[PDB]
């Protein structure tokens, strides 16, 4: 629900405030690229990236590193 609310806020008031979208997407991306976080934090970070950045930011940022992220987090978690 918070992710949806943030997405709507960013889509609405992103022009009056110039740096809102870059800041939100950058923070979410920085937090996402950290295996030390638990699954909940990573889920929240990916959701925030998708909500704020938009389809283009997702496609151009998350896809290249998915192969590494898989072996990094999913496989260790898949064995649980």
């Amino acid at each position: 629900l918070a992710a949806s609310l943030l997405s709507m806020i960013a889509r609405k008031y992103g022009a009056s405030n110039a740096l809102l979208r870059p800041k939100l997407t950058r923070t979410c991306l920085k937090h996402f690229l950290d295996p030390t976080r638990p699954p909940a934090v990573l889920f929240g970070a990916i959701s925030g990236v998708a909500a704020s950045g938009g389809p283009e930011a997702v496609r151009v940022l998350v896809l290249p590193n998915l192969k590494t992220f898989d072996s990094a987090v999913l496989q260790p978690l898949r064995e649980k």
Binding site: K30, L33, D34, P35
Partner: peptide, 12 residues
């Protein structure tokens, strides 16, 4: 360590 540096470079 080895993972932390790799992920930091990836974020950069």
């Amino acid at each position: 360590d080895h993972r932390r540096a790799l992920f930091a470079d990836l974020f950069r």
